[PDB]
Amino acid sequence: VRGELGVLRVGFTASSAFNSVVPTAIRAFRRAYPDVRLQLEEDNTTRLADGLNEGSLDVAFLRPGFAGSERFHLRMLSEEPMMIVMAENHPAASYEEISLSAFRDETFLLFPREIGLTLYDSVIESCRTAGFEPTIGQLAPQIASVINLVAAEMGVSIVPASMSQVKVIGVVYRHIADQTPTAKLALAYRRGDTSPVLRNFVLTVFP
């Protein structure tokens, strides 16, 4: 009965929310352990890291490949293909499978590097791997914000595959035929945490 009562702080990143595993993780756990009071905090991967260090978070969903990652339990959760979101009318939705080289001279909308550090450097690298430096467009607040801006035919973007559940009119998500760098997702917690509540949560994702 250890740890079936108390309070757990769960953090996750803005676009990781859209990945179906965070809502599932949370929903499963709130079933087994109704009595435990959750506390959800959505934030930057470095925010989630700092807060796990601080004691202000107990478990986080976050994108591995951050500096100092060799300080926590990092358990690989999810790997997802990255897809290009354009406007429906765009010339290139006509091509079946999209090569990123066809978007050299486009304006690439993106989140700020501080706003999404891990996703960004891999987004640029695919363009680079595709043989051009992307022209950065208008900075937008959240991953969903850029999708509506694509609907307004303002740019193309690259999003995790789980954003293709934002079915705004007038955008489409296509698949790149290059490296298709993925979006990794990892369950991260504190090394040495003997909380039972934490493992009640950590085994929920890993039964």
Added chain:
Amino acid sequence: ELGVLRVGFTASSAFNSVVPTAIRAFRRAYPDVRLQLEEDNTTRLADGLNEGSLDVAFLRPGFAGSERFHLRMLSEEPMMIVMAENHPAASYEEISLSAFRDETFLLFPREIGLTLYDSVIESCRTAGFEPTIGQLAPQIASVINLVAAEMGVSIVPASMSQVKVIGVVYRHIADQTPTAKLALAYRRGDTSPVLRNFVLTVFP
């Protein structure tokens, strides 16, 4: 026909097609104007109209200081309800608001905006209860994802139902509610021809 025009809009309106459609269309007709988009909530939108940083805004009418501007109504969409897919309420064809009295509501003023947030609260009260507000702490944009996680139920503009997050469903509200309104606003007496091309493109 030349210059820059500064356009602004609420995060939530960008799901209502009128905003992409009116931008996409103007961008076609007038490629020489450099569009500048500022996504922000209505109160700062008006602020930017006043201090001069914004020349038109898509926003929610009936705010205070709304007589210092021009506002022409653009759309009105009903507000629906998002709930987790294995909710008891999923199974009713038409749902009421009464049936959520003891329920947990997930409103975040940041995502939806004051004017919408308070009216949804008002709406519950008209049903016959004070809605028990879910998470005050660390407000995060996008409730649908906490609704997929069975943490509550939220009320969102009909536009938002294009967010087909797995594990949520959306249903219409049989209780007569207030709807989600959107105006289009510019300063009184702005005498730009570039500004007028934006308004005419929205209201042709």
